[PDB]
Amino acid sequence: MKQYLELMQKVLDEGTQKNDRTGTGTLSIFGHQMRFNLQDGFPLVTTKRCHLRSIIHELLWFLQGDTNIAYLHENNVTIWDEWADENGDLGPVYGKQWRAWPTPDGRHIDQITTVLNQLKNDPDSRRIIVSAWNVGELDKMALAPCHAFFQFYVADGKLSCQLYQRSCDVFLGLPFNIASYALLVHMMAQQCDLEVGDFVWTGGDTHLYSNHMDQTHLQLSREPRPLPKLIIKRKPESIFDYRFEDFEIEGYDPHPGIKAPVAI
Amino acid sequence: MKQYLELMQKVLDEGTQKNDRTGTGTLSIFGHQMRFNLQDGFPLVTTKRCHLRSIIHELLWFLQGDTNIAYLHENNVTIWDEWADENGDLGPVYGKQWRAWPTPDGRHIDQITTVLNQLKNDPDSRRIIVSAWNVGELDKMALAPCHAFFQFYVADGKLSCQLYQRSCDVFLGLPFNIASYALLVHMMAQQCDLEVGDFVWTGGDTHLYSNHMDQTHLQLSREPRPLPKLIIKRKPESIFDYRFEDFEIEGYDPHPGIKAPVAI
Ligand SMILES: O=C(Oc1ccc2c3c(cccc13)C(=O)O2)c1ccc([N+](=O)[O-])cc1
């Protein structure tokens, strides 16, 4: 997509040389922002083939509050396998915070229901927010949340959402993350009888791994194709009752997939 | 400042009509981002006079973990008076989360010390973060945190910081908030022996109250003056030992102050 390639070119042109915790080199900038008007089309990158399969399953899994990889195994989704312990536990990651943020006084807070209520009953609110950044639980997570925090906003019948992403692998992670939140905006909007507005992506440490330079140059040689259209085949009774088969993408004509490796 | 007037013009040109919780009308956009290279000068707005007095006292108060207005009363700082109860308690707002975020297991987490340690011992980290968004404690706060969340970043000897601000009154609040975090970057950087990089400001609901239109038009008629320079007169032993008198601003030549009213 224009915005995504622009970010990619920006990091090449402006990135400073920066290592990760493994010591793998990156080119890195700090602070970036992109906007996707969801009425223009579903923002799934076209300059390489991306599959929605794992994105949908992972979102549904988040929404269930499940932190065990079992449901992903049931569907042969393996993207969380590298972080899971021997019983398949990830500690209190995304799903547990979204659906059951624990408080000092023994409660478990369902931030998804909170936000849905707020969107229906108080759409002007400036605090419609879900955070996964539970400071006291970071140590137990297999991973500190990358998409840390998000806010919704309603104006003129349209639902928007902004994500803060503390750390972004622009090549491997970003296309996935964008489509993931865009999906959630479409499900949220449907459940509240709103149309879709903007997904605004904000990044902290926004980087390209040095071993992704050939792929980056290749993708930058390609022209964005028209955006696909998301189809929701069915309207469920709640945000928690979406099924995998509810979602279709039409008009997805991507250039070919490109593989990118990780160091260990 | 260029960036600040640009935002102001943007909200006039692009804001949609939007009420707050009191029902006061605003023009509002969602999602914006500005960058202040702190090496260019301290980003205190010049197109109206702003005083640093209350900004410094409030930051020092935040850094102490104090949530009672008593220390601000000692210095006749009254900006939190409208929210304080009869004993002057604000509930568990900023200071308590920064310095003593409470966990389900009975701990109190000092996020400022955490972040200082990380900046000194692991500056490549992509999770150097302070959050005030403690979901379980929102109900007890006199106010939900406006500056919800912030991340630091080090590259090339330079400390940067990004703030996520869920809600922004561009006319009254924004100049204050910018100078506040810019100050904290200068104190942080000093304590870690780094130079200063960028302050990146990111906003959610970014708005102008309709009863600020005359002031807005007036300020937009003015030309930014050169940025002032922050002087730190002394180097304290820690981030917690700054005193009010440690700070001076040089070369501050602002156009005249402009008053803006609030509805009740
Ligand atoms: O390797 C990663 O671990 C994850 C960290 C955080 C994550 C994921 C998710 C799905 C799959 C992996 C990860 C996810 O939904 O949130 C990773 C995480 C984040 C990104 N990113 O683009 O920021 C890229 C890679």
Ligand SMILES: O=C(Oc1ccc2c3c(cccc13)C(=O)O2)c1ccc([N+](=O)[O-])cc1
């Ligand atoms: O009236 C406000 O209450 C506060 C909300 C959140 C706040 C403050 C602070 C100082 C003084 C007031 C407030 C502050 O440091 O954080 C307010 C808050 C935030 C803004 N803003 O620009 O977002 C403008 C006004």
Ligand SMILES: O=c1ccn([C@H]2C[C@H](O)[C@@H](COP(=O)(O)O)O2)c(=O)[nH]1
């Ligand atoms: O009586 C109230 C008090 C608070 N809020 C919510 C929505 C407001 O947006 C937020 C208070 O902070 P602001 O975002 O409005 O600045 O809390 C209400 O809806 N009603």
Ligand SMILES: O=c1ccn([C@H]2C[C@H](O)[C@@H](COP(=O)(O)O)O2)c(=O)[nH]1
């Ligand atoms: O062995 C480790 C594991 C984690 N981290 C910190 C810094 C990393 O930036 C972050 C892991 O997430 P990333 O931001 O690196 O994606 O946690 C380390 O410093 N060392």
